[PDB]
Amino acid sequence: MTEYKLVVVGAGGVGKSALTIQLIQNHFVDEYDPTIEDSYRKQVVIDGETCLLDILDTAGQEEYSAMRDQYMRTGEGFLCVFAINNTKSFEDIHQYREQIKRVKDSDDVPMVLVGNKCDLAARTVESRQAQDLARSYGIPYIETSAKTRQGVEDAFYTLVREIRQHKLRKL
Amino acid sequence: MTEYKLVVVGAGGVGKSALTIQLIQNHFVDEYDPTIEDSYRKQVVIDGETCLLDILDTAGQEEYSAMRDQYMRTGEGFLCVFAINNTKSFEDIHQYREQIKRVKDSDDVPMVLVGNKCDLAARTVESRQAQDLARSYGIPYIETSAKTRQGVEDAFYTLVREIRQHKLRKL
Ligand SMILES: Nc1nc2c(ncn2[C@@H]2O[C@H](COP(=O)(O)OP(=O)(O)O)[C@@H](O)[C@H]2O)c(=O)[nH]1
Ligand SMILES: Nc1nc2c(ncn2[C@@H]2O[C@H](COP(=O)(O)OP(=O)(O)O)[C@@H](O)[C@H]2O)c(=O)[nH]1
Ligand SMILES: [Mg+2]
Numbered sequence: 001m002t003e004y005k006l007v008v009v010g011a012g013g014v015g016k017s018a019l020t021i022q023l024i025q026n027h028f029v030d031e032y033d034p035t036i037e038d039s040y041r042k043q044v045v046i047d048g049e050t051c052l053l054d055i056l057d058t059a060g061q062e063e064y065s066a067m068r069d070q071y072m073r074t075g076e077g078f079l080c081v082f083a084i085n086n087t088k089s090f091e092d093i094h095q096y097r098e099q100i101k102r103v104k105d106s107d108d109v110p111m112v113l114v115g116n117k118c119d120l121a122a123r124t125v126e127s128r129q130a131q132d133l134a135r136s137y138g139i140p141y142i143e144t145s146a147k148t149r150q151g152v153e154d155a156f157y158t159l160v161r162e163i164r165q166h167k168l169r170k171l
Numbered sequence: 172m173t174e175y176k177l178v179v180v181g182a183g184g185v186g187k188s189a190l191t192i193q194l195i196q197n198h199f200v201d202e203y204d205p206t207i208e209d210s211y212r213k214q215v216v217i218d219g220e221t222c223l224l225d226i227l228d229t230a231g232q233e234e235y236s237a238m239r240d241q242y243m244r245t246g247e248g249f250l251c252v253f254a255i256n257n258t259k260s261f262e263d264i265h266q267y268r269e270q271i272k273r274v275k276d277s278d279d280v281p282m283v284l285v286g287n288k289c290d291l292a293a294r295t296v297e298s299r300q301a302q303d304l305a306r307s308y309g310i311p312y313i314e315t316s317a318k319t320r321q322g323v324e325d326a327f328y329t330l331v332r333e334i335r336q337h338k339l340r341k342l
């Protein structure tokens with residue numbers, strides 16, 4: 001079947017493992033070891049297509065850049081996640097995008113911007129600032145909650161769709 | 172009269188000296204010494220108010236950050252300029268904004284985003300991506316041309332207006 005190599009990138013504590021796990025085993029996990037970086041697979045049907053998703057849940061002292069190299073140049077799409085309540089994780093998004101553009105040699109690599117923890121009623125990053133940021137980047141922005149599961153399938157599947165279009169564009 | 176300390180910041184070659192000089196001596200300068208960093212003053216009337224503008228035309232190996240310190244913590248407003256035809260100068264904007272927020276201790280310091288050289292019919296940065304970026308930052312975006320003078324007065328005066336409102340907000 002088709003295999004999409006995805007990389008979930010972002011500051012620590014944003015919820016990268018919680019989103020990944022949520023998608024894979026459909027259950028929320030608080031306290032997953034901040035240090036552990038590993039891949040996860042699941043077979044899914046997205047728009048009629050059966051495919052295998054290969055996800056790298058990035059963890060690591062890797063200064064706001066390219067965690068698991070031999071997966072970064074290979075990733076076909078990146079999920080840039082920040083937390084709706086941590087403005088710093090949100091400002092750090094530019095740096096990940098630049099490293100991703102840097103290793104991949106292009107400003108046309110599939111990516112989706114994810115504002116996670118939207119279940120927290122608080123926020124230090126308003127929905128509108130994120131959408132303008134995404135807009136200027138030309139990428140989608142989706143709000144998710146690993147805690148309640150809202151938006152996690154839309155986030156990853158939007159990323160697959162982006163990869164699909166991008167492949168279809170060389171013809 | 173009132174004095175507004177402004178700092179013009181941005182990658183080399185964008186046109187910081189050409190904008191500054193344009194405003195001060197109303198004439199275009201090609202080839203101004205890339206190394207020279209100095210201040211310039213002019214008395215102007217902006218919205219009925221007579222004021223003295225004190226501008227620091229930043230130049231210097233100062234790694235995408237805070238050129239002329241004893242002016243950065245003191246600047247009351249910053250003009251972030253990039254060239255409409257140099258995408259890198261445009262991506263470097265985030266770093267200047269962060270240094271500016273960093274020394275000034277706040278994400279509420281007056282600034283205006285300036286897309287210069289708009290006389291060149293070309294472009295690698297489209298007007299819309301810049302405006303979304305500005306929007307997400309909450310700041311104005313103005314396109315100017317040091318070469319033809321279009322927009323240079325609007326850029327600096329928009330910056331003064333921003334400083335004015337910001338001062339008026341503590342009451
Ligand atoms: N309320 C809430 N907490 C979350 C959400 N996603 C993750 N968390 C919590 O945020 C912390 C960090 O999650 P984790 O996936 O370990 O972070 P990361 O892998 O370093 O990005 C943990 O306490 C998670 O339980 C979310 O959507 N909602
Ligand atoms: N076409 C055009 N060239 C410009 C404009 N502004 C500056 N330049 C040219 O761009 C180069 C860099 O200008 P300068 O002010 O020295 O750069 P900076 O001080 O390092 O930001 C010079 O060749 C300037 O003449 C502009 O609005 N239009
Ligand atoms: Mg983790």
Ligand SMILES: [Mg+2]
Pocket residue numbers: 187188189203204205206207229230
């Ligand atoms: Mg100069």
